[PDB]
Write a protein that binds this ligand. Structure first.
Ligand SMILES: NC(=O)[C@H]1CCCN(C(=O)Cc2ccc3c(c2)CCC(=O)N3)C1
Ligand SMILES: [Zn+2]
Length: 140
């Protein structure tokens, strides 16, 4: 589990969104595994605006933050899980690291701020849903 709290937005994995998220919906995209809902309180996270390919992510199944090298956001085939059939996921970045289903939501960050959240796992790989192109998270 986990979310990004930027401005009056909460960014979560679409497959982990709650009823309150769907009832306060700002934007969602199944192909990216992302959903954004509105919040009453302002958050403290800042979004990175860059093309870094190195950063650090939080792994809840290890209680550890790991430094990783990751690919650029791309269209990647992801195997079936209990939330989606096997399909192509867009804006996804891969790295070598540990990721169990419940690790979804952990933040990946670089020197500029939050880059994305854990969205996929298995086979010794971790995949992150990028948020750096969502410029509207910084306003309104
Ligand atoms: N965004 C997505 O499509 C993900 C959301 C739902 C779940 N998805 C995952 O990848 C999560 C995942 C984590 C660990 C494993 C596995 C899956 C299958 C193989 C294995 O041995 N371990 C897919
Ligand atoms: Zn960066």
């Amino acid at each position: 589990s986990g979310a990004i709290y930027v401005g009056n937005y909460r960014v979560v994995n679409r497959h982990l969104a709650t009823h309150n998220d769907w009832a306060n919906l700002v934007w969602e995209d199944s192909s990216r595994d992302l959903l954004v809902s509105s919040t009453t309180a302002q958050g403290c996270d800042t979004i990175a605006r860059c093309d870094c390919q190195t950063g650090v992510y939080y792994c809840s199944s290890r209680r550890k933050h790991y430094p990783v090298s990751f690919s650029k956001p791309s269209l990647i085939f992801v195997e079936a899980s209990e939330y989606y059939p096997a399909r192509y996921q867009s804006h996804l970045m891969l790295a070598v690291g540990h990721s169990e289903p419940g690790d979804c939501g952990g933040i990946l960050r670089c020197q500029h701020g939050v880059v994305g959240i854990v969205s996929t796992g298995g086979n010794g790989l971790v995949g992150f849903a990028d948020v750096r192109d969502l410029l509207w998270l910084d306003e309104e």
